[PDB]
């Protein structure tokens, strides 16, 4: 019934995937993510946080920051802190 | 270069389409994700190609 | 998605640049083209320049523009830095409603102004 | 109990499904051997 | 990858687009887009056409690395491919993933 | 096997880019001088033949040295490899190639290899 | 029998912020992938020896096999900075460790009294062959590999290599086959 | 009249459906990771001991 192995078999594939891609990524270029941002906000006045971080290869914590930059999120009452451009 | 302002006109028709393409911006929406996909390959290839040109 | 000109947010990169140099503390009046130059983005083209004047410029709320040369538009008020006892000093102005987002980055970090204030009769709160 | 019912408990039952990639389990006969400890 | 521009093929090629704009035969713009349709043809090309089965060796001088490309300088190597051999001082080496 | 493939490759792309010449306003004349112009060149250059050519903490900088000049690096007619890397592996000065899909001009001739494999020490 | 050093990694301040990008294309053999790691690696043949050039202007080298190779090497890459333009400066070349390797030359089984006591000593056949014998009073960590071969790592000076094989030449003398 | 096995069925039944959502439960969330699951370490032994 028991047998004995090292690393269990399902922990060896995530490791190739995690090492692949190193987590997320690192922090510089915000305006010229700023342009592919307006780009993706053109499509959706309102965009999902979750959305964007796919559209990103760059951390969440930094998006957040200039997400929060170019406008104040809204819950939109249908929750995910949807992003708008500022009015101002 | 009148045959040429004559085709920037007909540009000027496809730019009346733009006006439409303005309207238009579902399907639509893929094909622009598709081009955010895009410009991020630019950006990577763009670079490619500064690379090409140290080997150059 | 209305009409855009060239590059997205070439505007936004101005607005940026015009902010850099104010928080640098060299603050010189710029006309458009002076910032674009700044930018880089000078050589926009003839029509998308145009579109930045016409509809861009315009856009913005608070822009604004002494004559020939665009003037900082989010703070009307220089970001002197100085004189923080004085608007202390007229107590119904409250220091004419000064904002964190202006201060940190006037022309210091806050926290060496903040040494100085505590120093100093002013006392700092934030609700 | 054990020669038959038990068979047909574990043979008979709702496939397990679970789903992008889906995952199948299929159950096939019961053995039971000698009580051990 | 716009990796095989600077070889004689893509040169040749460049410099006759370059003239056709000097005699105002074409036009530059669209001479970026044949470019772009170069990219693909060359790519294509490499991956599926010819393939040959190898051995060899060399020795190091400068590494580098960025946009996943690697750029090798090597001197006093020697490269042999089935009968042929090669004597070379100074070989640089440009490899896309 | 060399000259075949870039005729091909020239069949190919002129035929692609034949459909942008005519969508961009322009005669075939001037695709079929574009060819004449490629094909041109590389006869004048004679580098092959081909079907187509038928026709203190501070003082840092006292000893010196230890760098050389950047210049040893580049020649524009050094032997120039281009291909596709696999695993390119170091352990210590140790290091060890494993390329493909490359094109070798070096002692003057053109070799092309599938995969290459080499070792070399730094 | 005396100790050799093996390894020295120190820490070297240069004192000012450096863009990663500029000094990877001009430093010749200096390799900066950003995704595996965040610090140019760049290594250079006279004295051998690996630098993780850091964004922050902090330095760390690596595998140089005395005091003054470790010192010499980073004075070099300071200077290789200076060459490209950055500012540069040396601060507080400060030695974090130096590995040590001797043979004491014979045989040696420490089980028989592994069992009765092991405070100082945690072995474990599966995980590894060597024991590792933490010592307390002097701050050294030493392997005991069944052929003979002893590694002694994280000595921050060059007495505490050699203290601590002294202080443990002893318990391997009692316990020699 | 129920005798001894079909009063265990009963007991046994419910178990036995126990065991096979649990199993549900414990690889659904290992196949949200996307990890994959081993349904020897899915089953739990005790359910139905």
Known sequence: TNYKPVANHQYNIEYERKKKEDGKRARADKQHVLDMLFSAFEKHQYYNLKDLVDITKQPVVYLKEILKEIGVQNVKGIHKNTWELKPE | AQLKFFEQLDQIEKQRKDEQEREILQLRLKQKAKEMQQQELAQMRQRDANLTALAA | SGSSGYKFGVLAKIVNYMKTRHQRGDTHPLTLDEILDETQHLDIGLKQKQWLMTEALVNNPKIEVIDGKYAFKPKYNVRDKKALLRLLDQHDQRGLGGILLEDIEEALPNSQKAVKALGDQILFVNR | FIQMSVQRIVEDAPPIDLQPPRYLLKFEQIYLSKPTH | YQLYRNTTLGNSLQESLDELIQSQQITPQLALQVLLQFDKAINAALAQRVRNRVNFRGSLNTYRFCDNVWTFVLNDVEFREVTELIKVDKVKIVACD | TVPKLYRSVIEDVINDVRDIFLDDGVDEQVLMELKTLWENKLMQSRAVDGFHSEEEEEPLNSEDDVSDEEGQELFDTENVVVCQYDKIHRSKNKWKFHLKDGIMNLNGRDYIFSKAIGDAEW | ?177 | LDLAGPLLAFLFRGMFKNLLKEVRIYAQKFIDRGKDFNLELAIKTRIIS
């Open chain 7, 1 to 177: 029998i005396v100790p050799q050093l093996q390894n020295i990694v120190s820490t070297v301040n240069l004192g000012c912020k450096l863009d990663l990008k500029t000094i990877a294309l001009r430093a010749r053999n200096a390799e900066y992938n950003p995704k595996r790691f965040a610090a140019v690696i760049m290594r250079i043949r006279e004295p051998r020896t690996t630098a993780l050039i850091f964004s922050s202007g902090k330095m760390v080298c690596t595998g140089a096999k005395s005091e003054e190779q470790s010192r010499l090497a980073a004075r070099k890459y300071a200077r290789v900075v200076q060459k490209l333009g950055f500012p540069a400066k040396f601060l507080d070349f400060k030695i974090q460790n130096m590995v040590g390797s001797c043979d004491v030359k014979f045989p040696i089984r420490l089980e028989g009294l592994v069992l009765t006591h092991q405070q100082f000593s945690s072995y474990e056949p599966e995980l590894f062959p060597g024991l590792i014998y933490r010592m307390i009073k002097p701050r050294i960590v030493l392997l005991i590999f069944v052929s003979g071969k002893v590694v002694l790592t994280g000595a921050k000076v060059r007495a505490e290599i050699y203290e601590a094989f002294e202080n443990i030449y002893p318990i391997l003398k009692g316990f020699r086959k």
